Amino acid sequence: LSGLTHKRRLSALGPGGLSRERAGLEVRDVHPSHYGRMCPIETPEGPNIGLIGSLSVYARVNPFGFIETPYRKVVDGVVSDEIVYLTADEEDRHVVAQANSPIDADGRFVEPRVLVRRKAGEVEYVPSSEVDYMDVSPRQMVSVATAMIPFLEHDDANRALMGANMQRQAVPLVRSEAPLVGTGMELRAAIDAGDVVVAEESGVIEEVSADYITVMHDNGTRRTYRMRKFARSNHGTCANQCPIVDAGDRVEAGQVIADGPCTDDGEMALGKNLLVAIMPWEGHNYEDAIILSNRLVEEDVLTSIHIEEHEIDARDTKLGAEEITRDIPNISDEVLADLDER
Amino acid sequence: LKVPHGESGKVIGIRVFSREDEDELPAGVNELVRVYVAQKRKISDGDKLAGRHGNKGVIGKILPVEDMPFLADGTPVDIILNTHGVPRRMNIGQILETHLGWCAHSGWKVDAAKGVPDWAARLPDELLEAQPNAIVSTPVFDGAQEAELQGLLSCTLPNRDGDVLVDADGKAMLFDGRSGEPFPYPVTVGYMYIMKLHHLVDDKIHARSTGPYSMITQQPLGGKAQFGGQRFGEMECWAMQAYGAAYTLQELLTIKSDDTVGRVKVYEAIVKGENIPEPGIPESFKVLLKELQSLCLNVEVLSS
């Protein structure tokens, strides 16, 4: 999820852009034209607030560089299944309906008056005929990270932003479990993340192994996928892959074959499920403190793996060249008992 | 090369690059070797946890499994959250999430013999019958309403013992692990998703008593990796002045940061039973002198 968010990030500073001190404070505030293009929730907590956004779920860049947003045009008060993409200028020049507004199965507006968004910061009911455009889904303004926070319509803006930022700091555990409650944008956000392999053609698996897999295509071509095991991640954590397929199954194309870090059956899983209780207990949970049962400690429920990295080099010098050698002056045999011949 | 200060674990693999084997290397190097050390960390005190609703926290204490409160059927809880922080922060969503998680975990079966209840009119026809450890998903801005939760909480499947733990409101009767007697009032319980942040405790904890000293500034190194001491800001000097504490400030500025002979003598005195000798002239002052005397400004001392 962190990698996907970084790939989807929208920076506003750096070379060729304004600085922190010269940039005005107003630019850091929302604009009525941000709906559908840049999420208003996700944002760094630090001083770089408002200068780093994120694409919306359905946002697509036009060939010139103006962000677009899908819409279905109402011709005569009847919803149209076909959809078109509109930019800011064209969006302003038209009437955009509300997705949550009830609509009959035949495309007829049950309500004569439907709320609508207007030129700028204007919303007002209008007859159900002049309305021209309607949104696609209620989730058209949220970011990818914010789109997977259940009951987001009940929290506060600051709390929602804090949770969204926190979601990008999880640590891959040893035994992940899929959440019991979570939006439907979990598996899709994992398949597109790239950290999970997937079959290209519908074939039948001949044999599987902890280190590699071999799938037989229906055309008679054998293919093999190699899965890296316990390779240090770019930030110090571990990354692994465990195939979740059995020997002798005709796996269809597009079906996940292995689960990467923070995954469980081809869907994101950044944590576990714990039985919580809400009550002050002897002040040990005083002022945001937390109490944990030893069952978690003794069952590896929240056990993680971290891999360090060190390197040494022997570079030539004017006084000579350094060489790595088992022997070392004035050192007891016990100290170097671990070094090998080389 | 030696392991830095505060690292341990197994050695999983060693990569060595040699110029003899025709391996590209940075100019002026012959043998660069890297070693990977992997350590398994178990969650401990001083670790951050937080849900998906932005409610951070730290592990105040890890009580034994025999001390945590347990449900009427003997199922000890795994974590306890404070309540005063919910209404002030105004993040009531997590309560609904916990209720829904408990409902999904326990499994439900909404009555339909007499017909779909009015509150269950909009529920999908395939969502009226669930199984234990079921999976549910509420898309943002379109999910179960309050009435849906009210109805679902009233039809949860009973435990294998034949009794239902939680009430319609969602609260339950517990039993104190220490006193052994039930609490006077019910409490809310349920399953809530918990992540693990990257701000571990092992990285933060660090100590330094005596170690390598910088050669250019004559000051102890900095950073946990280098095994260096902590910084001492000027606000700390202001605070020390405020209390009127003088000898402490003198030590902090002279006998533990700069004075070489001072450090040696005080260390030896502590090793023995002798009293700590008074500090001397800090290296900073002597450097300032020998530098200001370079601008023809005769800086005398006037010891008299």
């Binding site: 598996l187 899709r188 194309a253 | 529920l123 969502l127």
Partner: peptide, 25 residues
């Protein structure tokens, strides 16, 4: 409506249908 072949089954509190799948992220 699971676009991917073998994703886990998790019924949802669906009330409205989105006429287009999420584009390639």
């Amino acid at each position: 409506n699971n676009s991917v072949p073998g994703a886990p089954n998790r019924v949802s509190f669906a009330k409205l249908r989105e006429p287009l799948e999420v584009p390639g992220l």
